[PDB]
Amino acid sequence: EPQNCSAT
Amino acid sequence: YPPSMDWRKKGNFVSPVKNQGSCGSCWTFSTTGALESAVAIATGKMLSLAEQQLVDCAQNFNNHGCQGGLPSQAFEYIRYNKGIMGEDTYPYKGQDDHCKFQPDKAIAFVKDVANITMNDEEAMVEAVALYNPVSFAFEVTNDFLMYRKGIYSSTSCHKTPDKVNHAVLAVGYGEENGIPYWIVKNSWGPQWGMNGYFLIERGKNMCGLAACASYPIPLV
Ligand SMILES: *[C@@H]1O[C@H](CO)[C@@H](O[C@@H]2O[C@H](CO)[C@@H](O[C@@H]3O[C@H](CO)[C@@H](O)[C@H](O)[C@@H]3O)[C@H](O)[C@H]2NC(C)=O)[C@H](O)[C@H]1NC(C)=O
């Protein structure tokens, strides 16, 4: 499952 | 795994420290940094890839030029886009612009992208020890903005995916009198930190550094 990260 | 690693020592695998200027494009320097090392490790060729291309062209992958992005997304972009040009053909301007990608000028390519399991720092250690320098994102607080040298350790930062706000590149690791750390390359110029690098405590998912890490597998 892909990375649902805040925009870094 | 091994007690310490440093890709800069293994050979000419880590490119010089760069400067994102006033644009929040660290995610792009973390991306090029990871891909430059991968290509050099696999072929021995040392290239300098265009971060500006990512700033102007990677919007289809949820990236936002000077407003942010994620290395894994940028790796996928390069992959589907079939290439990234060198710094000498698509110069870093440091501001959001219009995409000027030329397919005939692409010099580095991505086959696949490996996403480290969320919060799996050990897996991150293996990737750095065995395969390539790793791109990761972490939460930067005021505590960190005061950094000069040494092993950064803080109680103010969070370790959650929605808090990470800066993208950097793990080039190795080691320990000092029992305190394990990571050797990290930044893109704020060579006059920042330790010649452009910084050490941060390893083993505690410090500032969420294992929340969103990835590295590319190049097409060579
Ligand atoms: C690692 O994490 C990244 C970021 O979440 C994941 O990126 C996504 O990768 C998929 C392919 O697995 C991309 O889909 C493809 O998009 C292109 C362009 O739209 C399209 O032509 C293809 O048919 C396909 O749909 C997707 O764009 C990309 N998402 C983002 C936001 O970049 C990646 O899947 C993860 N890898 C693994 C192994 O989990």
Helix (H, G, I), strand (E, B) or coil at B174: strand
Query: What's the Cα-to-Cα distance from B70 to each of B32, B138, B210, B216, rounded to whole Å?
Result: 12, 11, 13, 13
Q: Which domains does chain B have, with CATH numbers?
A: 1-220 (3.90.70.10)
Q: Closest partner residue to B68 among A2, A3, A7, by Cβ?
A: A7
Query: Active-site positions of B?
Result: 26, 166, 186
The residue among B189, B193, B192 whose CA lies nearest residue B152 is: B193
Q: B111 — phi, psi (to 5°)?
A: -90, -50
B27 C-beta closer than 6 A to ligand 1: no
Counting one residue from chain A and one from chain B, the pairs whose CB atoms sit within 8 A come to 43
**B127: DSSP letter:** I
Query: What's the Cα-to-Cα distance from B195 to each of B148, B186, B191, rounded to whole Å?
Result: 10, 9, 6
Helix (H, G, I), strand (E, B) or coil at B103: helix
How far apart, in whole angstroms, are the C-alpha atoms of residue B117 and residue B213? 8
B212–A contact, CB cutoff 8 A = yes
* Structure tokens that stand for B209 in this block: 């550094």
Query: B172-209 burial, b if ≥16 CB within 10 A, otherwise e?
Result: bbbeeeeebbbbbbbbbeeebbeebbbbbbbeebbbbb
Q: Do B83 and B107 form a contact (C-beta atoms < 8 A)? A: yes
How far apart, in whole angstroms, are the C-alpha atoms of residue B127 and residue B119? 14
B166–A contact, CB cutoff 8 A = yes
Q: Do B151 and B179 form a contact (C-beta atoms < 8 A)? A: yes
B73 C-beta closer than 6 A to ligand 1: yes
How far apart, in whole angstroms, are the C-alpha atoms of residue B215 and residue B128? 9
The residue among B183, B186, B158, B164 whose CA lies nearest residue B173 is: B183
B42 contacts: CB under 8 Å, gap ≥ 6: B218, B220
Query: What's the Cα-to-Cα distance from B133 to each of B11, B191, B194, rounded to whole Å?
Result: 13, 22, 18
**B104: DSSP letter:** G
| Packing angle of the helix pair B71-81, B26-43 (nearest 10 deg) | 60
Residue with tokens 């992005």: B69
* Structure tokens that stand for B172 in this block: 């190795």
Contact list in A for residue B67 (CB cut-off 8 A) is 7
Residue with tokens 């696949």: B112
Helix (H, G, I), strand (E, B) or coil at B173: strand
